[PDB]
């Protein structure tokens with residue numbers, strides 16, 4: 001294959017925030033911020049399904065697998081990041097499928113998974129489920145991923161409006177999730193970091209109770225990344241969120 005130049009290793013100031021919530025008992029969200037041998041940065045977030053058994057086992061499994069595989073890696077080019085994320089996500093899905101099938105305590109477990117590979121100017125995002133990746137600056141908050149949910153299937157087919165989907169009685173249903181099938185087709189995205197201040201990854205425990213406007217205005221205000229994370233978690237709890245709330249906040253600079 002053709003001669004290509006090595007981009008430098010790049011990372012963003014990113015922090016991981018997770019909370020079980022008062023209303024639930026255990027945290028079935030997992031995730032983390034991991035680095036490979038050349039110090040490339042991978043952000044990982046998983047939402048284990050609460051309606052099924054052992055959501056924390058599934059999310060923890062996918063997270064630990066991605067951490068091990070990525071930390072074992074040396075270099076991933078930008079034009080190969082899509083293949084890397086898709087392949088490893090597929091294999092982890094297969095392993096999680098047989099993991100749930102063979103263990104009777106874990107029968108039917110599953111988890112969402114959104115993850116981002118950070119490069120000098122782009123971010124490569126892979127998504128399976130209704131966890132989200134946003135990009136935010138002073139003027140716009142754009143959701144990069146598309147929810148693999150039923151209500152978003154109705155939205156994308158003109159059957160309901162997004163505002164209707166936010167209060168739809170079946171807004172919890174997931175249509176693509178890890179561990180339920182032998183195969184999975186993850187959604188893959190490339191996003192330019194030119195004109196944005198924040199990359200956000202979050203489970204639905206946040207955005208099921210905090211709309212994009214509130215996130216945008218909270219983030220575009222002044223304050224450090226720790227202050228923004230604290231205020232964002234507290235805003236999720238103030239809007240009476242009753243799921244696990246987890247998000248990675250990544251500050252971007254030119």
Ligand SMILES: [Mn+2]
Nearest residue numbers: 047048049050
């Ligand atoms: Mn969950």
Ligand SMILES: [Mn+2]
Nearest residue numbers: 050053054055
């Ligand atoms: Mn459970």
Ligand SMILES: [Mn+2]
Nearest residue numbers: 130171172204
């Ligand atoms: Mn949901």
Ligand SMILES: [Mn+2]
Nearest residue numbers: 047204205243
């Ligand atoms: Mn959730």
